[PDB]
Structures are given as C-alpha cells and as structure tokens.
Write a protein that binds this ligand. Sequence first.
Ligand SMILES: [Mg+2]
Ligand SMILES: [Mg+2]
Ligand SMILES: [Mg+2]
Ligand SMILES: [Mg+2]
Ligand SMILES: [Mg+2]
Ligand SMILES: [Mg+2]
Ligand SMILES: [Mg+2]
Ligand SMILES: [Mg+2]
Ligand SMILES: [Mg+2]
Ligand SMILES: [Mg+2]
Ligand SMILES: [Mg+2]
Ligand SMILES: [Mg+2]
Ligand SMILES: [Mg+2]
Ligand SMILES: [Mg+2]
Ligand SMILES: [Mg+2]
Ligand SMILES: [Mg+2]
Ligand SMILES: [Mg+2]
Ligand SMILES: [Mg+2]
Ligand SMILES: [Mg+2]
Ligand SMILES: [Mg+2]
Ligand SMILES: [Mg+2]
Ligand SMILES: [Mg+2]
Ligand SMILES: [Mg+2]
Ligand SMILES: [Mg+2]
Ligand SMILES: [Mg+2]
Ligand SMILES: [Mg+2]
Ligand SMILES: [Mg+2]
Ligand SMILES: [Mg+2]
Ligand SMILES: [Mg+2]
Ligand SMILES: [Mg+2]
Ligand SMILES: [Mg+2]
Ligand SMILES: [Mg+2]
Ligand SMILES: [Mg+2]
Ligand SMILES: [Mg+2]
Ligand SMILES: [Mg+2]
Ligand SMILES: [Mg+2]
Ligand SMILES: [Mg+2]
Ligand SMILES: [Mg+2]
Ligand SMILES: [Mg+2]
Ligand SMILES: [Mg+2]
Ligand SMILES: [Mg+2]
Ligand SMILES: [Mg+2]
Ligand SMILES: [Mg+2]
Ligand SMILES: [Mg+2]
Ligand SMILES: [Mg+2]
Ligand SMILES: [Mg+2]
Ligand SMILES: [Mg+2]
Ligand SMILES: [Mg+2]
Ligand SMILES: [Mg+2]
Ligand SMILES: [Mg+2]
Ligand SMILES: [Mg+2]
Ligand SMILES: [Mg+2]
Ligand SMILES: [Mg+2]
Ligand SMILES: [Mg+2]
Ligand SMILES: [Mg+2]
Ligand SMILES: [Mg+2]
Ligand SMILES: [Mg+2]
Ligand SMILES: [Mg+2]
Ligand SMILES: [Mg+2]
Ligand SMILES: [Mg+2]
Ligand SMILES: [Mg+2]
Ligand SMILES: [Mg+2]
Ligand SMILES: [Mg+2]
Ligand SMILES: [Mg+2]
Ligand SMILES: [Mg+2]
Ligand SMILES: [Mg+2]
Ligand SMILES: [Mg+2]
Ligand SMILES: [Mg+2]
Ligand SMILES: [Mg+2]
Ligand SMILES: [Mg+2]
Ligand SMILES: [Mg+2]
Ligand SMILES: [Mg+2]
Ligand SMILES: [Mg+2]
Ligand SMILES: [Mg+2]
Ligand SMILES: [Mg+2]
Ligand SMILES: [Mg+2]
Ligand SMILES: [Mg+2]
Ligand SMILES: [Mg+2]
Ligand SMILES: [Mg+2]
Ligand SMILES: [Mg+2]
Ligand SMILES: [Mg+2]
Ligand SMILES: [Mg+2]
Ligand SMILES: [Mg+2]
Ligand SMILES: [Mg+2]
Ligand SMILES: [Mg+2]
Ligand SMILES: [Mg+2]
Ligand SMILES: [Mg+2]
Ligand SMILES: [Mg+2]
Ligand SMILES: [Mg+2]
Ligand SMILES: [Mg+2]
Lengths: 137, 117, 52, 112, 101
Amino acid sequence: KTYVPKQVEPRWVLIDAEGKTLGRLATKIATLLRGKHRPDWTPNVAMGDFVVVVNADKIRVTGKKLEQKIYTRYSGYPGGLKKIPLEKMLATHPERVLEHAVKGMLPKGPLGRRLFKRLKVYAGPDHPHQAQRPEKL
Amino acid sequence: PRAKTGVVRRRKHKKILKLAKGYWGLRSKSFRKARETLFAAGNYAYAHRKRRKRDFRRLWIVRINAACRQHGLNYSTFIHGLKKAGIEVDRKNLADLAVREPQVFAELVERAKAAQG
Amino acid sequence: AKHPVPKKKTSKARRDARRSHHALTPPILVPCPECKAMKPPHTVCPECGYYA
Amino acid sequence: MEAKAIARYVRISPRKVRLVVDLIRGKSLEEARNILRYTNKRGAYFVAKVLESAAANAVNNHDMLEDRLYVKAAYVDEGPALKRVLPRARGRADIIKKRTSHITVILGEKHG
Amino acid sequence: MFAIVKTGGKQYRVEPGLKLRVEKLDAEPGATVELPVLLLGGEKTVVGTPVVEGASVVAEVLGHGRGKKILVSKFKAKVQYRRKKGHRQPYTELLIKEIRG
RNA sequence: UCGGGGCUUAAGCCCAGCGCCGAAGCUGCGGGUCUGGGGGAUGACCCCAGGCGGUAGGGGAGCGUUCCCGAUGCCGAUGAAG
RNA sequence: GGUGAAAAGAACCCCGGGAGGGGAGUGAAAUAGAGCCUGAAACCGUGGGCUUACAAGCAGUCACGGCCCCGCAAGGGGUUGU
Ligand SMILES: [Mg+2]
Ligand SMILES: [Mg+2]
Ligand SMILES: [Mg+2]
Ligand SMILES: [Mg+2]
Ligand SMILES: [Mg+2]
Ligand SMILES: [Mg+2]
Ligand SMILES: [Mg+2]
Ligand SMILES: [Mg+2]
Ligand SMILES: [Mg+2]
Ligand SMILES: [Mg+2]
Ligand SMILES: [Mg+2]
Ligand SMILES: [Mg+2]
Ligand SMILES: [Mg+2]
Ligand SMILES: [Mg+2]
Ligand SMILES: [Mg+2]
Ligand SMILES: [Mg+2]
Ligand SMILES: [Mg+2]
Ligand SMILES: [Mg+2]
Ligand SMILES: [Mg+2]
Ligand SMILES: [Mg+2]
Ligand SMILES: [Mg+2]
Ligand SMILES: [Mg+2]
Ligand SMILES: [Mg+2]
Ligand SMILES: [Mg+2]
Ligand SMILES: [Mg+2]
Ligand SMILES: [Mg+2]
Ligand SMILES: [Mg+2]
Ligand SMILES: [Mg+2]
Ligand SMILES: [Mg+2]
Ligand SMILES: [Mg+2]
Ligand SMILES: [Mg+2]
Ligand SMILES: [Mg+2]
Ligand SMILES: [Mg+2]
Ligand SMILES: [Mg+2]
Ligand SMILES: [Mg+2]
Ligand SMILES: [Mg+2]
Ligand SMILES: [Mg+2]
Ligand SMILES: [Mg+2]
Ligand SMILES: [Mg+2]
Ligand SMILES: [Mg+2]
Ligand SMILES: [Mg+2]
Ligand SMILES: [Mg+2]
Ligand SMILES: [Mg+2]
Ligand SMILES: [Mg+2]
Ligand SMILES: [Mg+2]
Ligand SMILES: [Mg+2]
Ligand SMILES: [Mg+2]
Ligand SMILES: [Mg+2]
Ligand SMILES: [Mg+2]
Ligand SMILES: [Mg+2]
Ligand SMILES: [Mg+2]
Ligand SMILES: [Mg+2]
Ligand SMILES: [Mg+2]
Ligand SMILES: [Mg+2]
Ligand SMILES: [Mg+2]
Ligand SMILES: [Mg+2]
Ligand SMILES: [Mg+2]
Ligand SMILES: [Mg+2]
Ligand SMILES: [Mg+2]
Ligand SMILES: [Mg+2]
Ligand SMILES: [Mg+2]
Ligand SMILES: [Mg+2]
Ligand SMILES: [Mg+2]
Ligand SMILES: [Mg+2]
Ligand SMILES: [Mg+2]
Ligand SMILES: [Mg+2]
Ligand SMILES: [Mg+2]
Ligand SMILES: [Mg+2]
Ligand SMILES: [Mg+2]
Ligand SMILES: [Mg+2]
Ligand SMILES: [Mg+2]
Ligand SMILES: [Mg+2]
Ligand SMILES: [Mg+2]
Ligand SMILES: [Mg+2]
Ligand SMILES: [Mg+2]
Ligand SMILES: [Mg+2]
Ligand SMILES: [Mg+2]
Ligand SMILES: [Mg+2]
Ligand SMILES: [Mg+2]
Ligand SMILES: [Mg+2]
Ligand SMILES: [Mg+2]
Ligand SMILES: [Mg+2]
Ligand SMILES: [Mg+2]
Ligand SMILES: [Mg+2]
Ligand SMILES: [Mg+2]
Ligand SMILES: [Mg+2]
Ligand SMILES: [Mg+2]
Ligand SMILES: [Mg+2]
Ligand SMILES: [Mg+2]
Ligand SMILES: [Mg+2]
C-alpha cells in the first residue's frame, strides 16, 4: 500500500527574477508551488515550497509583447471589459505580470488557491528576511 | 386464488432504501430517487475502479520522476535504463523506494545510467 | 395561479434556512423597586402601582 | 429525576406554538414563568398552562423542590388536522387545515 | 532486510514476520511455499537480470479465503438495461518467515 | 481569449533520430459462465482450447407472491404471521 | 369493520375554566385507554455523533486524511476535508 507522508516542513525558496523569461520562469515556480519535485508528492495536501521572487519588475519577455499582448479584466457592468497592455502593467504594480502567470498555471481548485498564497512576489530586491533565503535559479 | 401484493413491494423497496442511506435529502428517502441515484453510483464505481489503477500508475510516476530529477536524470531516461538493464523488477509502484530506502533507488539509478551508453 | 408559479417544491433545507430569522426574542424585563416582581422597562405594572 | 406533562389536541398550529416553546427550553422555572408572563403570542397561554401543570406534577408527585427545577426539555407535536372547505371564486373550492398541537414539557431537578 | 517478491502477477515488498494477502495460490492450507521469485534486499540484492538468480523467500500459507463482496452494477439509460453481479475475489493469506538468498 | 496560462535559435512550421507517457485494446494472476474436445466404467469431478457490448426480438435456467395435495400430519406462548 | 379472555372502561388525589395530563388502580400486556390489535412510508419534531460561512453544485464515486464509535488488540461502522 502506497506511502503517505505526514506533517513536514515547507522549504522556503528565493528566486531572482530579473533576466528570466516570463512564462519560462512561471512554469518552474508553479512546479515548486506544488510538491511535484519532492518524491513524497501528494496531490491533495499542499506541500510545495514557499517560493519568493524579487526584482520581478525586471522580467524579460520576447517578441513585441510589452507593446502588444494585453490583459483583460471584466467588471459585471456593460462595457465593463477593461484592457491593459503588458507595458502599463509593469509601469504600475509589476509583480502582477508574474503572478498572473503563475496563478494561471496552478490547478483551479480550492487547493490551487492555498498554493497561490505560498507564492510571494516582490518588485525587489529585498523582502521579509524571515528564515530561509535559499538562492535558486 | 387472489395474490395480493402484500410484503413483496415494501420489501424490495426497503432494500434499495438501505443501499441509499447517507445520500442527500429526498435522494435517500424516496425509493424512486434512491434507485436512480444508485444506478449512477454503481456505474461510477465500476468506472472509477478501472481508473483507480490508472490513477496510482500516474502518482507513482511523478514520485519516481521527482527522485530521478534530483538524482540527475529524468523519468523517461531512467525507465529506459532500467528496461534495458533487464531490471524489470521495479514495478512503478515499488519505485516507492525513492521515498524510503533511497540508497537502493540510487543503486538503481547507476544501473540505468550504465545501460544508457 | 394566474401567471407566476413556483418552478420547484422548495427543499427541506431551503425552507428552514429561510426561517433562519424567525426565532423570536424573549421579553425584556426589569425588577421594579416596589416589589421583587418583574416588569417591562418604563412601564407601570399592576400588583405594585407607582410613586405618584 | 424528571417530571412530564402533556396537553394534547390543543387547537393551534404546531409551527406557531413551537416558536414559544423554543423560547423557554432549558430555562429555569423562574425566568420561564416570566418569559411567558410577558411574551406577546397566543402560544404563551397554552405553553404556560402545561408548564405550570408540569410543575405541580413535579412537586405533588415526585417530591421535587419547586424553587429548584428547570425545563430539562420540551417540544410540540402535530395532531390530526381539522380540514374545512373554503368557498372560492368562480366556484372553485379548497380545504384549509385548522391544524393542532401536542405540547409536552418535561421538568427536572436542578443539581445535586 | 527488504525483499521485493512477485506472485499472482504482482510484486510486494516483504519483511519476515509480515502477514500478507495475495492472489490465491494452490497449496496445502498450512504448508510452506517459498516464492522462488525475488528481487532486491536490505543491502541491495538488486536483480540485474530480471530475477536474482539464486535466492528465495520462505512463506507459510496461512490459509485461503474470499474477499468482501463487491456489487458490479451496470446500467444503461433510454434502454432498460441493468445488470447486477456480486463479486468476491478469492485470496490466500501468507506469513513470511525466511528470506534466505 | 490559441481549451487557458503562456511560448519567438519556440512550447510555431519542416527534415532526421532516440526514449517516455498512454485505453476497459494486448500481457500477467485469480474467478465466473457457455461451447467444443479429452480422462473419469463412474452420477460427482478434473484437464485443455475457445467464446461472453447490445436496442427490437428469439431461446434457455431460475427467484418470489396466493391457493391445493403432502395434513386426523409437522412447527408454534420456551412466542405463528407481520 | 377490530379495546380485552372478561369493562375489570381508570374511584380518589394533584395542575387545569375545560380539554388534556401526572399519581394511583385494573390487566398477562394500557407502547391494549376507548375509533383503543398489529402500526410499514411519505411527512413533522426533540436529543446526540461527524460536518459546514473564499465557495460554482444530477449531489455521487475513487483515494487519502481527520473526528466519533463498536472488538484492549491486525479490523469494521458513522461523518466529510482535500
Ligand atoms: Mg517542468
Ligand atoms: Mg493572467
Ligand atoms: Mg489538482
Ligand atoms: Mg476544470
Ligand atoms: Mg475560481
Ligand atoms: Mg399489484
Ligand atoms: Mg432529509
Ligand atoms: Mg424521511
Ligand atoms: Mg504504467
Ligand atoms: Mg431541516
Ligand atoms: Mg431539522
Ligand atoms: Mg381533544
Ligand atoms: Mg434547542
Ligand atoms: Mg391548553
Ligand atoms: Mg400534580
Ligand atoms: Mg410518579
Ligand atoms: Mg419543537
Ligand atoms: Mg392529520
Ligand atoms: Mg372570497
Ligand atoms: Mg377561484
Ligand atoms: Mg383548488
Ligand atoms: Mg395548506
Ligand atoms: Mg446509458
Ligand atoms: Mg431506459
Ligand atoms: Mg434517455
Ligand atoms: Mg430507446
Ligand atoms: Mg435487471
Ligand atoms: Mg496552448
Ligand atoms: Mg498556465
Ligand atoms: Mg513568447
Ligand atoms: Mg518535405
Ligand atoms: Mg527534406
Ligand atoms: Mg530517413
Ligand atoms: Mg521516417
Ligand atoms: Mg523510439
Ligand atoms: Mg510506454
Ligand atoms: Mg492520453
Ligand atoms: Mg476490461
Ligand atoms: Mg486483463
Ligand atoms: Mg481466466
Ligand atoms: Mg477459466
Ligand atoms: Mg456469468
Ligand atoms: Mg457461446
Ligand atoms: Mg464440457
Ligand atoms: Mg480437447
Ligand atoms: Mg466426457
Ligand atoms: Mg465420473
Ligand atoms: Mg477406467
Ligand atoms: Mg458417461
Ligand atoms: Mg474462460
Ligand atoms: Mg453495448
Ligand atoms: Mg412458484
Ligand atoms: Mg404477489
Ligand atoms: Mg387468500
Ligand atoms: Mg392446521
Ligand atoms: Mg380432527
Ligand atoms: Mg418458534
Ligand atoms: Mg405466556
Ligand atoms: Mg421466536
Ligand atoms: Mg420474544
Ligand atoms: Mg418475527
Ligand atoms: Mg366482551
Ligand atoms: Mg364505557
Ligand atoms: Mg388519570
Ligand atoms: Mg398529588
Ligand atoms: Mg384539583
Ligand atoms: Mg377554551
Ligand atoms: Mg382530569
Ligand atoms: Mg410514585
Ligand atoms: Mg399508571
Ligand atoms: Mg407496541
Ligand atoms: Mg419503548
Ligand atoms: Mg367508548
Ligand atoms: Mg371510540
Ligand atoms: Mg382518538
Ligand atoms: Mg410510528
Ligand atoms: Mg399512533
Ligand atoms: Mg413513521
Ligand atoms: Mg426526522
Ligand atoms: Mg433530527
Ligand atoms: Mg439534529
Ligand atoms: Mg456515539
Ligand atoms: Mg478573492
Ligand atoms: Mg452526472
Ligand atoms: Mg483509508
Ligand atoms: Mg481514514
Ligand atoms: Mg485525539
Ligand atoms: Mg474519546
Ligand atoms: Mg470509516
Ligand atoms: Mg466527497
């Protein structure tokens, strides 16, 4: 009968964002958010590392993107569809662009959100120097 | 000779109603609703029974692949090494060794890296 | 009957949930100074009277 | 111990009186008499009626101390409804249930 | 020490003194059968070739039995098709004793 | 809004290679039933090979309900039916 | 259409205007109390165990996990978080 892990401790990680290609980084970030790298992986628990990102304001992204490529929010009201280009996202709160990527990469369930909270993204550098600052690339 | 219904109907009913204990609302009180639900239930079980295997095969893979990843190679190549090295032993389930008794998993990694080339 | 009608018998759960706020509150009472008895505040009550 | 008292066939809807009963469940006999003494519902009269009888039974039959007993539990049950025909428009007609209640109140000694 | 052993088309990790339910074997209800099938150990037997040529695991057939019944309900809509089969899978319990190899 | 996120010496397109994932298909292990074929003199039973999605519909084998013979019987207050 | 073998149909006391109850008493039984044998289901309610207020649902099913409960015990029952 297959092994079930018990209450273990979350491994807090720290990733430097600047230079990294947006989507490419998000993918790995997501994987870390779930277990999926720890061989005691369990799909219904929440055991992914606490990823911390810094210098997110400096994420690289190929092609025209920034100019083109737009994020759309929808208010409930008529015409309530807002459209905001990648450019202006970074202009203001930029950690958004990475978050909206990692979030869209997490499973959509009630667990998915638990995990989305373990992801801490900052304009960086610097952040809550709690405990582990295990540089990672 | 007249054969009333009598016990017969009630009894066949109570049976199903037993099977439905625990279901939401009318679904565990009404015989007609109960049967209908059971119909669905039985079919689900039979199909989840088929899936259950297909489910663990997957779980194992990830756990194996996770251990292979930290051990240098990936799952794809790992299996190949093993499949080539004749070590048909490790059924993807028993590759739970990755979780406990890692030195054995490790031993099994080199055997695969050996069979590579 | 004519025009609008309920599309479905409301469930046991839905009914009672609606009746969430049905529970009435107990009366508010205070002991009058004259007797040890209980009376609703700001009200003269028989079996006692008043100080004019 | 505990003292029971039941008034059956009370000509009033259960759902209605039930509102009053829930008001005094667990309460002490003292605050209870008061809660009904000043509750603004028809059910009061009936629930009080059975509550006071429960008391009498408690003491005159079980040596229980009046000034020491509470409402260990109480509940109201539905009795056989009186169905009546209500003439309606365009000749249609329908029955209206003048429902009915079974009010039980069971008292009990405070502590020991 | 560990011991990966296959039987009844399936494999199991096994310690001595372990009780284990397995695909019904043909054996005296209280006899002794060693699973001439084996892979791995507590100190890495590691079966290069499929099996570990020269090794075995002694086990005492503790008894035979039948599993809890499972209702396999089949049902199709629009076409009044329903089937109810009761299924209890036969099995034999083993007691693992030696792991000599 | 390409299913989404997201992707630009690609996560796009084309050419070549190796490996892996994967369905109730196939394999293994156990069980069931049908048919054919083998021993069993034997009824029993075992062995081997193969078949078993299904509506209209045809065929086969059963389960339960009331009543009758079995009843001047047997069970039943140490408790019938329900 | 049905109390019970028999009315033995509940004196008397207690709460209540009464109804209806609580004691007492009858009976094998009163969960046989009078529309009274057995008393199924829908339906209504009281108590208790598990559970639920960031979550999108033919209401189940598969897995794991927690709480509660029956065998101190390897087991099983209830519940439902993911
Ligand atoms: Mg990856
Ligand atoms: Mg987004
Ligand atoms: Mg998921
Ligand atoms: Mg989905
Ligand atoms: Mg959502
Ligand atoms: Mg009929
Ligand atoms: Mg219900
Ligand atoms: Mg019900
Ligand atoms: Mg597989
Ligand atoms: Mg309710
Ligand atoms: Mg309720
Ligand atoms: Mg009356
Ligand atoms: Mg209450
Ligand atoms: Mg009254
Ligand atoms: Mg009295
Ligand atoms: Mg008494
Ligand atoms: Mg109530
Ligand atoms: Mg009625
Ligand atoms: Mg009118
Ligand atoms: Mg009308
Ligand atoms: Mg009408
Ligand atoms: Mg009505
Ligand atoms: Mg169908
Ligand atoms: Mg149909
Ligand atoms: Mg249909
Ligand atoms: Mg059809
Ligand atoms: Mg059928
Ligand atoms: Mg895509
Ligand atoms: Mg994504
Ligand atoms: Mg791109
Ligand atoms: Mg070409
Ligand atoms: Mg070419
Ligand atoms: Mg070529
Ligand atoms: Mg080619
Ligand atoms: Mg290939
Ligand atoms: Mg493959
Ligand atoms: Mg696939
Ligand atoms: Mg299959
Ligand atoms: Mg198969
Ligand atoms: Mg077979
Ligand atoms: Mg066969
Ligand atoms: Mg069959
Ligand atoms: Mg055939
Ligand atoms: Mg034959
Ligand atoms: Mg033959
Ligand atoms: Mg023959
Ligand atoms: Mg023979
Ligand atoms: Mg012969
Ligand atoms: Mg013959
Ligand atoms: Mg066959
Ligand atoms: Mg079919
Ligand atoms: Mg017959
Ligand atoms: Mg019949
Ligand atoms: Mg007859
Ligand atoms: Mg006779
Ligand atoms: Mg005679
Ligand atoms: Mg008998
Ligand atoms: Mg007797
Ligand atoms: Mg008996
Ligand atoms: Mg008895
Ligand atoms: Mg009986
Ligand atoms: Mg008589
Ligand atoms: Mg009389
Ligand atoms: Mg009396
Ligand atoms: Mg008295
Ligand atoms: Mg009096
Ligand atoms: Mg009156
Ligand atoms: Mg009286
Ligand atoms: Mg007494
Ligand atoms: Mg009495
Ligand atoms: Mg009874
Ligand atoms: Mg009882
Ligand atoms: Mg009479
Ligand atoms: Mg009468
Ligand atoms: Mg009556
Ligand atoms: Mg009843
Ligand atoms: Mg009744
Ligand atoms: Mg009932
Ligand atoms: Mg209920
Ligand atoms: Mg309840
Ligand atoms: Mg409740
Ligand atoms: Mg309990
Ligand atoms: Mg939110
Ligand atoms: Mg469905
Ligand atoms: Mg479990
Ligand atoms: Mg559990
Ligand atoms: Mg505890
Ligand atoms: Mg406890
Ligand atoms: Mg359980
Ligand atoms: Mg569930």
